[PDB]
């Protein structure tokens, strides 16, 4: 990739091509790149007991396309989800171009901008995965959903290890990575970048809700050939009757005692809250009794971490007054602030579909006897609040969302367990590589006599250009023998003043709701 | 398959062929097919709080061979289990034939039956697995163990999802499947059906009990090179002594403190009951305090489900007065009713063999400190009642029984854990397909003037014919260097009036006991 | 097609195969055939002034598959309509088989039925179209929607010409057709029939609603270069002002005066009625002032005929209290009678979608001046109630329904106009041929001495068998660049006691609502 100054170095492609069981999304967006940290690396750190962290902020920016709406349009996502029991990324190709480097000159009063033709910009992809991976933390920076929205490239920054739960102080293990210590490609207008990636083979995402329920997978018309204890006494009253060993053949209408082959999957109880302000308990944000303490969390090296997405568990409804972590929440259309007090201002996700295989988040997994029953003792009935893997469990994973993550890098650790990103998406060992970009520094007028001191005065600059990502998605059509019509993502937003999923009168594009994927159905 | 009326369309095969490490069981049985639901599909449903269920009952019947005694004879099962450390299904072939369709005519007083030559019967195999799988729920309907016992084909019926724990009401997800919306093969006498299947590669079943115990896998003659804390004080009395840090080299006779490499597998405590009526606690069947509540159970969408078979855990003995779920119970020889009060009337299974690797069902997994010990505090000793998977665990799975299930379909869910049917058997992703069969409807005399109303009057009919299943089993001979004789399944039923495992004087075949598989032994 | 008695002569096929842009529906149903008109042809006739008719009723039955639900399942129809901007029949193959002829014998008290092996049944297809075509009159007789519903074959009967509007009397033109004067194929059990047809090339059906409206097809941001008269005076008051010739450039916000290139298509005003009983006018059924008179109708040879389906016109809504002819009405799920008084008991169709191109049924086409305006005269503003074709008109045709007609034969007349069946469907010159079937007469015991008199005594008989139709449908996927999600046929029937679009607890299948086809959208 290399030509002249007055020659576009690439074209605008915003395809959409469906077929058999392959769909290829292609999209381009214009971007802007500032001069981060005024050209330098800055060591980050701040002791915040549990929020304690340390690291570094770099002068580099980076492209992030880890959000579904970066590739599919509303209509597409609809297509995709109303006719396919699953999908998955297969291949990706990214390309940056039409680089334009600008140098600003703030006048006596206001700023004036001009084209620095010979100025260069750098790009390079960490395809060896030797740098903290940031594109999968569910953070901002991905491309805009709306094709014609210009966006700012995010600043690259990474965290180191926090030794302790007190100080951000760093050990001899903490490491510093320098992006200049990498081979980068230098570009000027007329040059361009391009790269290709191939997704690892990964399981198709569900994209369907279950019909049958795990506890009702038998023939309602027939007896088991298995027997069990029905009751130890004769009455209808606890601890009172002639006392006997009553065994049953386990036949229809019973079912809750039918011997079964599979159990619901692992769960960890979550605290449930109400959207109606006065049904909660009045826990504060800050303080020694901050919400954190009362919400189910994990503990790493003395530090707390909300069990946020957490294990795949059946959740509350999107409409239900109850909600909780485990439920993804996105900003509403009219919500533009770091804070809100009106539930109706936000968007609530829901894993209600999982109630066919997984346990409910706020409830429990089941119950255990708290001791050994006797003729002179009925044991306490304990609560199975958290339960790990056990032979015979099966479960569904969290759904995927139109404005959700697409993939996440699996942690470089010997051993794990069922690698599905908890925020959702595809867990890859080596995922789409992070592409870094940064404007090259331009020394301003220099001293006329030598100085071993590093340069300070730099011309002020910023760049802009387009970028396009093309991902090949493998999808699988359904083919069920279900007779009755299925549920489907439909418009149904009724009459409206300014069409939904479209810019308003002021020219602002905003996403009305969150869209799932599990509309279609498959049995167990 | 297609010939004449006076020409058998198949022959009777009840082989048995052993060899190297392959055994092929072949068996045929005669069957009868009624006219279920008087030809129509009926929506099922009944709100029973926790036993709540919904679904449909179909006009179709189905062949089920998911029981070991359907294929092996007593003697065979014996052969199989006294010389092989394992086995597994490899291939299957089923064929239906000698179809005979009969039409009944109830006379003024009593019924008279005749042959409807031209009447047809339908068959088809759901080999795309697009229909609720029912053959693995441990229900009745499989073939009779006794070769010369005529059997009735089961009615096909399936359950939908239960949304809630209150109402059987159905949502837009519930689905209705219609078997007529499938390509079925129509037969008349002279026609026949046939099909072949190949089992997925699946782990051989154990078929052996362990010698060594997981906690005793070392050399009893030598010291470890590892050290540990033996005691914190000097006396023989708790909280009393000169208080010191006493470390040991961990040498013979100790063993319970030896550093080991593996832990017992996951477990969930089960309530234990006594067979002697007055040692229990007098819990009722029905009621707000039904046995269910007090027995360890799971909770799906607010509904309860006994943790019946549950996790592989060492169990009580077959003779022990204590028993519990986790133990398979079959009807005794003289037990002919949906209920019983005499333990000795039934047959108790037992996983006593697992006590070499798994934890005991009624007991616990182990113990944990309930807090941090101090010089001014000895923490509560907590009970590890339920424990999921943890790096380093190992365990044995539930045994297989002569009259037990053979396989079960693994649930269509992203992710599970160690897919061994909990009732026992082989967990296949796509198992032997369900073969459906139903008599074709025959309109009785019709109206002489048109009517857009669906037909009601149907000749009364039923069919009968033979069916044969052939399964190729892969088995592995032992080859241990064990010196002393091994345990073996022996007759030993002493003297008797009417030989056991044989019809009585009245001509009734009944199975005396339940037969396991783990008679042979292998170390760890 | 010819084999033995104990050999099925065909199998049961109820496929469904989707792909690129071709879908093949295959379905089979069991049927019953009586002995119509007790074996003879009967001349029909009845003078009913306007309902006057004449013709003949035949001893033959006939297969009719001219209803969409005969081929697609609920789910299919859904598939079909949520992803395709159109479809059309391409090829058809029908086959009858498993013929079973039964002879009844009513005993002293009640009837007894037996198999008459040697009895024959006749079939033949009028593929020369030389017989009144009846399969397209929107009458009963097609196959049941539910695969497992036995149905009665309809009786063939046809009408002749009615000369007059008084008498059913027939002229020398009236003709009598005899089906025995055709080559028919005789069958016995073991024989079978089969035939193939290929649809004529015919326009794909719409299957989409319009975005843009015919009167708003310009750029809302720009002026026309055309001028027009805006007002003849100065005030804001009719007939009052300084009187002038005010011409305008015809620019935005106006639009209703913009010069346009196309006009809405032809229409004929229909009378509108209200579903709320007391908003009508109290017109009687019978009488000299029967509803007919007051409802827009056509007049052929003095006879009246409701302008029922009539011209493609925008209609009322399915929910609107107003309804009218022009709107297809089907029986509700719980409606089982030739009459009803509760609108909510029935199912209302709606062409509301056509309001983007066609005029509204109950309203009018537009307005005309009733004379020539002058400085001393303002003409009556007339109502354009009925308007035929005029250069520049464009229009959409009536939608198609899940339980609607599929095709209709175009009348054998020199000339017509835009041949789209008014009830809806595909207008073919030579459509799927009518397949006739009738049981062959079997003389009962005969006289022992000759008689030139035609036979009377016939054994009583009826037959039954299966039939299957396979139609290859050509469909076209969409490919719009629409951004916002589209409307879609979704379940959404909320919670329910007995799942919809599925048999109830009593085993009765009933269709909940009527399903259209225009869910997707295309502009103009
Ligand atoms: N998103 C995603 N990525 C990878 N694997 C997934 C994912 N979702 C479910 N699984 C399953 C597929 C295999 O059973 C498995 C292997 O983990 P392993 O530790 O590699 O043996 O985890
Ligand atoms: N009956 C049966 N069927 C299948 N697998 C069994 C069974 N019994 C034990 N296992 C083991 C074999 C592999 O370790 C495994 C894979 O589960 P997967 O989720 O496929 O990675 O589970
Ligand atoms: N259903 C159907 N069948 C046939 N033609 C249709 C139909 N619907 C719309 N049209 C149009 C297609 C041509 O413009 C036409 C020819 O009529 P002709 O008199 O043959 O010149 O009518």
Nearest CA in chain B to C38: B448
Ligand sitting nearest the alpha carbon of B427: 2
Rounded CA-CA distance B176/C503 in Å is 9
DSSP C102-130: EEEEE-SSSEEEEE-TT--EEEEEETT--
Q: Which helix (H) or strand (E) holds B127?
A: none
What the block records as the tokens of A254 is 């019973």
Is-contact A360 A315, C-beta < 8 A?
A: yes
Q: Which ligand is nearest to the CA of B206?
A: 2
Q: What are the residue boundaries of the structural domains of chain B, listed by start?
A: 1-524
The helix (H) or strand (E) run that includes residue A292 is helix A291-294
Q: Identify whether the C-beta of residue B189 lies closer than 8 Å to the C-beta of residue B118.
A: no
Question: How far is the C-alpha of C437 from the C-alpha of C141, rounded, in Å?
Answer: 13
Q: What span, in angstroms and rounded, lies between the C-alpha atoms of A42 and A57?
A: 5
CA separation for the pair C479, B285 (Å, rounded): 61
Residues of chain A with C-beta less than 8 angstroms from the C-beta of C148? none
Q: Which residue has the tokens 């579909």?
A: A353
Binding partners of C (≥3 Cβ pairs within 8 A): A, B
Closest atom of ligand 2 relative to the B407 alpha carbon: 1
Ligand 1, atom 11: nearest CA belongs to which residue?
A: A418
Rounded to the nearest angstrom, the minimum Cα separation between C345 and chain B is 18
CATH architecture of C1-524: Beta Complex (2.170)
Closest among C147, C77, C83, C26 to C491, alpha carbons compared: C77
Burial of B446 from C-beta contacts in 10 A (0-12 / 13-18 / 19+): buried
C488–A78 C-beta distance less than 8 A = yes
Give the C-alpha separation, C466 to B120, whole Å. Answer: 11
Q: How many whole angstroms from its chain centre is CA B13?
A: 26
Query: What residue of C is the nearest CA neighbor of B167?
Result: C497
CA dihedral defined by C80, C81, C84, C90, rounded to 10 degrees?
Answer: 50
Whether C485 sits inside 8 A of A82 (CB atoms) is no
How many angstroms separate the Cα of C191 from the Cα of each of C4, C5, C125, C195?
8, 9, 16, 14
Nearest to C499 among B117, B119, B176 (CB): B176
- Contact assessment for residue C196 and residue C91, using Cβ atoms and an 8 Å cutoff: yes
Chains that touch B (3 or more CB pairs under 8 A): A, C
Q: Which of B9, B45, B113, B443 to mutate to test the interface with C (most CBs of C within 10 A)?
A: B443
Which residues, in sequence order, are CB contacts of A479 under 8 Å at separation 6+? B128, B130
Q: How far apart are CA C520 and CA C486, in angstroms?
A: 6
Which chain B residues are closer than 8 Å to C32 by Cβ?
443, 446, 455
DSSP-assigned letters across all residues of B358-416 = SPBSSS-SEEEESS--BTTB---EEEE-EE---TTEE-------TTSB-EEEPPSSS-B
Q: Given a contact as 3+ CB pairs under 8 Å, which chains touch A?
A: B, C
Could B450 and C155 be called an inter-chain contact, meaning their C-beta atoms sit closer than 8 Å? yes
Q: Could you count the other beta carbons within 10 Å of the beta carbon of residue A64?
A: 21
Mention every residue, 6+ apart, whose C-beta is less than 8 A from residue B466.
B10, B12, B28, B29, B30, B31, B96, B97, B98
Contacts of C486 in chain A (CB under 8 A): 75, 78, 490-491
Cα separation of C27 and A101, whole Å? Answer: 67
**Residues of chain C found within 8 Å of residue A480, distances taken between Cβ atoms:** 75
Q: Ligand 2: distance of its center to the CA of C177 in Å?
A: 72
Query: Which of B391, B414, B415, when mutated, tests ligand 1's pocket best, judged by the most ligand atoms within 8 Å of its CB?
Result: B415
Distance from Cα B420 to the centre of ligand 2, integer Å = 7
Contact A392 B311 (CB under 8 A): yes
With contact defined as beta carbons under 8 Å apart, do B192 and B10 qualify?
Answer: yes
d(CA A134, CA A158): 7
Cα C43 from Cα C58, distance rounded (Å): 9
The three-point CA angle B454-B456-B461 to 5° equals 130
* Residue C50 to residue C239: CA distance in whole angstroms: 50
CA dihedral over C200, C206, C212, C214, signed as positive or negative: positive
Q: How far apart are CA C340 and CA C344, in angstroms?
A: 10
Q: What is the rounded CA–CA span in Å between residue C202 and residue C86? A: 12
Count Cα neighbours of A91 within 13 Å in the Cβ-side half-sphere: 7
Q: What are the DSSP E strand ranges found in C171-236? A: 185-187, 193-198, 208-210, 228-231
What is the C-alpha to C-alpha distance for residues C463 and A162, in angstroms, rounded to an integer? 86
Residue C372 has which token pair?
């020539």
First to last CA, chain B: 52
C268-279: buried (b, 16+ CB within 10 Å) or exposed (e) per residue? bbbbbbebeeee
- Per DSSP, the three-state class of A353 is helix
Q: What is the resolution of this structure in A?
A: 3.2
Q: Tell me the CA distances in angstroms from C413 to A84, C409, C410, C417, C429, one per residue in order.
A: 48, 12, 8, 11, 11
The closest residue, in CA terms, to atom 15 on ligand 1 is A418
With CB atoms and an 8 Å threshold, state whether A230 touches B291.
yes
Question: Is the distance from CB of A13 to CB of A25 less than 8 angstroms?
Answer: no
All residues of chain C having their beta carbon less than 8 Å from the beta carbon of residue B59 are 148
Radius of gyration of chain A (CA): 28
Pure H helices in C239-329: 291-294
Backbone phi, psi, residue A220, to 5°:
-65, -5
* Closest Cα to atom 7 of ligand 3: C420
Residues 6 or more apart in contact with residue B135 via CB below 8 angstroms: B62, B64, B66, B409, B431, B432, B434
Report the DSSP beta bridge partners of residue B150.
Answer: none
Among protein residues, the one with the nearest Cα to ligand 1's atom 7 is: A420
The phi, psi pair for C86, rounded to 5°, reads 155, 160
Tell me the best of B413, B414, B417 to mutate to test the pocket of ligand 1, counting ligand atoms within 8 Å of each CB and taking the most.
B414
Q: Residue B245: which H helix or E strand, with range?
A: none
* DSSP state for residue B265 in the 8-state scheme: P
Cβ within 8 Å, pair A391-B420: yes
Query: Which residues, including other chains, have CB under 8 Å from residue C340's CB and lie 6 or more apart?
Result: C332, C346
Ligand 1 environment, Cβ below 6 A? A 202-203, 416, 418-420, 426-427; B 414-415
Looking at residue A385, the DSSP 8-state letter turns out to be: -
- Give the closest ligand to the alpha carbon of residue B419: 2
Which ligand 1 atom sits nearest the alpha carbon of residue A416? 19
Answer whether A236 sits within 8 Å of B338, measured CB to CB: no
Q: How far apart are CA A276 and CA B505, in angstroms?
A: 75
Q: Rounded distance, CA A117 to CA A107, Å?
A: 21
Round to whole Å and give the CA distance between C354 and C420.
15
| Residues C100 and B118: beta-carbon distance below 8 Å | yes
- Give, for B98, the enclosing helix (H) or strand (E): strand B84-106
What secondary structure letter does DSSP report for C293? H
CB count within 10 Å of CB A177 equals 16
Query: Chain A interface, mutation test: which of B43, B289, B416, B421, most A Cβ atoms within 10 Å?
Result: B416
């Amino acid at each position: 990739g290399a030509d002249g100054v007055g020659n576009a170095s690439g074209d605008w492609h915003c395809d959409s091509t469906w077929s058999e069981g392959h769909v290829t999304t292609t999209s381009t967006r214009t971007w802007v790149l500032p001069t981060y940290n005024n050209h330098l690396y800055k060591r980050l750190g701040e002791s915040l007991q549990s929020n304690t962290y340390n690291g570094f902020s770099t002068p580099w920016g980076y492209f992030d396309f880890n959000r579904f709406h970066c590739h599919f349009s509303p209509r597409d996502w609809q297509r995709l989800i109303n006719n396919n029991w699953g999908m998955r990324p297969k291949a990706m190709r990214v390309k940056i171009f039409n680089i334009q480097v600008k140098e600003v000159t703030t006048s006596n009063g206001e700023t004036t901008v001009a084209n620095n033709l010979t100025s260069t910009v750098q790009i390079f992809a960490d395809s060896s995965y030797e740098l903290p991976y940031v594109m999968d933390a569910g953070q901002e920076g991905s491309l805009p959903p709306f094709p014609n929205d210009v966006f700012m490239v995010p600043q690259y920054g990474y965290c180191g290890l926090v030794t302790g739960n007190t100080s951000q102080q760093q050990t001899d293990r903490n490491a510093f990575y320098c992006l200049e210590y990498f081979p980068s490609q230098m570009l000027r207008t007329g040059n361009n970048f391009e790269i290709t990636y191939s997704f690892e083979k990964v399981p198709f995402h569900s994209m369907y809700a279950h019909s049958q329920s795990l506890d009702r997978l038998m023939n309602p018309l027939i007896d088991q050939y298995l027997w069990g204890l029905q009751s130890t006494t004769t009455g209808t009253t606890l601890n009172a009757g002639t006392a006997t060993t009553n065994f049953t053949k386990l036949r229809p209408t019973n079912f809750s005692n039918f011997k079964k082959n599979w159990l619901p999957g692992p769960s960890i109880k979550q605290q449930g809250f109400s959207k109606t302000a006065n049904q909660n308990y009045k826990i504060p944000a800050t303080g020694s009794d901050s919400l954190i303490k009362y919400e189910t969390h994990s503990t790493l090296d003395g530090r707390w971490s909300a069990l946020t997405p957490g294990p795949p568990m059946a959740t509350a409804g999107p409409a239900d007054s109850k909600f909780s972590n485990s439920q993804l929440i996105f900003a509403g259309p009219k919500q533009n602030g770091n804070t809100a007090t009106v539930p109706g201002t936000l968007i609530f996700t829901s894993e209600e579909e999982l109630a066919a295989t997984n346990a409910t988040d706020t409830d429990m997994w089941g119950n255990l006897p708290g001791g050994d029953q006797s003729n002179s003792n009925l044991p306490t009935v304990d609560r199975l609040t958290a339960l790990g893997a056990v032979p015979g469990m099966v479960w569904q994973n969290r759904d995927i969302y139109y404005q959700g993550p697409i993939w996440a890098k699996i942690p470089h650790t010997d051993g794990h367990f069922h690698p599905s990103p908890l925020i959702g998406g595809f867990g890859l060992k080596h995922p789409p590589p992070q592409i870094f970009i940064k404007n090259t520094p331009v020394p301003a007028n220099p001293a006329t006599t030598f100085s071993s001191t590093p340069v300070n005065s730099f011309i002020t600059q910023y760049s802009t250009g387009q970028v396009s990502v093309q991902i090949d998605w493998e999808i699988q059509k359904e083919r069920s023998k279900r007779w009755n019509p299925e549920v489907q993502f439909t418009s149904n937003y009724g009459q409206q003043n300014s069409l939904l999923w479209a810019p308003d009168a002021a020219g602002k594009y905003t996403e009305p709701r969150a869209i799932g994927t599990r509309y279609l159905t498959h049995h167990l």
